[PDB]
Structure formats: C-alpha cells, structure tokens
C-alpha cells in the first residue's frame, strides 16, 4: 500500500527482523536493493560490499536484499 522508508521496522524472508537503512541501486549488482541492520548477528556485512558503503552497523548485522524479500507486519 505504500513503498518501504528508510527507517522502518521490516522481517526478511524467515522472519528475521531488522530495519532499513539504505534503499536504492547499488554497485554490486543491478536493480533495487535494501540495505537492513539485523536484530540478530545473523547477516553478512557491516554496511559496506567490496569497499563500497551503503550504510553502518556492526560486521554481522547487516545484509542486503532484494525488496521483494522482505515484508511488513
């Protein structure tokens, strides 16, 4: 009903929850992305891919993914 926002409360596929901080295309690869911060240290980065940052969280927390992956509640 509405786009996602910087800043909103999100659950990735499995139901992992986190928050947005970054939405946008990226260097890594084409298309939409978004860029959470886990509540869990179960992600991939700490905002940056190849040098590149996007945003900051601690090195575990963070993961980016495809909108569509994600959902609302």
Request: proline share 7%.
């Amino acid at each position: 009903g509405s786009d996602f926002r910087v800043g909103e409360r999100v659950w990735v596929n499995g139901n992992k929850p986190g928050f947005i901080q970054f939405l946008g295309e990226t260097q890594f690869a084409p298309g939409q992305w978004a860029g959470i911060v886990l509540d869990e240290p179960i992600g991939k980065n700490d905002g940056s891919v190849a040098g590149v940052r996007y945003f900051q969280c601690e090195p575990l927390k963070g993961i980016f993914t495809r909108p569509s992956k994600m959902t609302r509640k």
